[PDB]
Amino acid sequence: DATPVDAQLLKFGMSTALSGPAAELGINMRHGILAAFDEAKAKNHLPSKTLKLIALDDGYEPARTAPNMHRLTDEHEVLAVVGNVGTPTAITAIPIAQQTKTPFFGAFTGASALRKVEFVINYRASYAEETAAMVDALVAKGIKPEEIGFFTQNDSYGDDGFFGGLAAIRRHQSVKVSSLPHGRYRRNTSQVEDGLADLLMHQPLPKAVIMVGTYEPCSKLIRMARMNNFNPQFLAVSFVGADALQRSLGDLANGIVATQVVPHFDSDLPLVREYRDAMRDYDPELPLSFVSLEGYIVGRILVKAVTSIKGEISRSSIAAALEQLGQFDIGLGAPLTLGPNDHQASSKVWPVLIGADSSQSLAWEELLS
Known part of the structure; x- marks a missing residue:
């Protein structure tokens, strides 16, 4: 009760399939992000910052996505909504992110609707x-x-x-x-x-x-x-x-x-080896998957962007930092590119x-x- 806490809490949100018949998608995206956050803590990548993921279940149903997104953007005041699974869910979620000016980053969906949406920034190919x-x-x-x-x-x-x-x-x-x-x-x-x-x-x-x-x-x-x-x-x-x-x-x-x-989770690409180490330390009982590797990549890119921020970490500074990444390398074997007019990092x-x-x-x- 007497201990100073000067670490800034950085809250990120997610609405995703944590139950229901597509639960493996959301469960594993969440694990990948959390493994990335675990690694960032372990390696002091964000000194005096505490990462927190608020992950709400929508069962891959847009009817549940909407109230989840309102809660994440309103009461939880999240800095970004990261890694949400799905297309019909994203189509419901995106207007809420837009109206609250909340970055909607790394959604697990290749839909063209996310790729025309100023606040929608993607990692994956379509x-x-x-x-x-x-x-x-x-x-x-x-x-x-x-x-x-x-x-x-x-x-x-x-x-x-x-x-x-x-x-x-x-x-x-x-x-x-x-x-x-x-x-x-x-x-x-x-x-x-x-x-x-x-x-x-x-x-x-x-x-x-x-x-x-x-x-x-x-x-x-x-x-x-x-x-x-x-x-x-x-x-x-x-x-x-x-x-x-x-x-x-x-x-x-x-x-x-x-x-x-x-890339394959068995690859020896530097990022993939880092993924395997992060997963092993996070929870060695979890099987590797393409899904959690994607979540880990999303987490890694987010952390890289946050590290670059000078000044207040906010929705606006995160959106700017993601666009400031430019052409960058995270050990995937080929460069990623993001910018003001380029909101999909990879076409591979x-x-x-x-x-x-x-x-x-x-x-x-x-x-x-």
């Missing part, structure tokens, strides 16, 4: 970029544009990935949007039967299915496809959660390709091939080999 990489690689291997199908969540997330795929296909062949194979499922359900039937009845039958969904419904779709005598090349976007997908499917995940917005897409027991980096020229 769904347009992931789907372009997939489509170009498929076509290079002799898959016809008309043979590429989509299995997507029936909302703004699935729409965004589908539209990215459509644009990528259109670069190779003019098509009407109604011609593409496109099965859908409702967010946070396992109701994938109708979507599978739509793919199966398509002319021609898809040879590749791009999955713009989450791990639970995607796992069920893959199991059901194989039961229904259908074995195309499945490709999962980053948001699916490749680690959770592999855990659910086991051997049935062997051969799936999944695009990531981070790292494909991985899921095997029997693990995943490994994939060169696109080895796709379907």
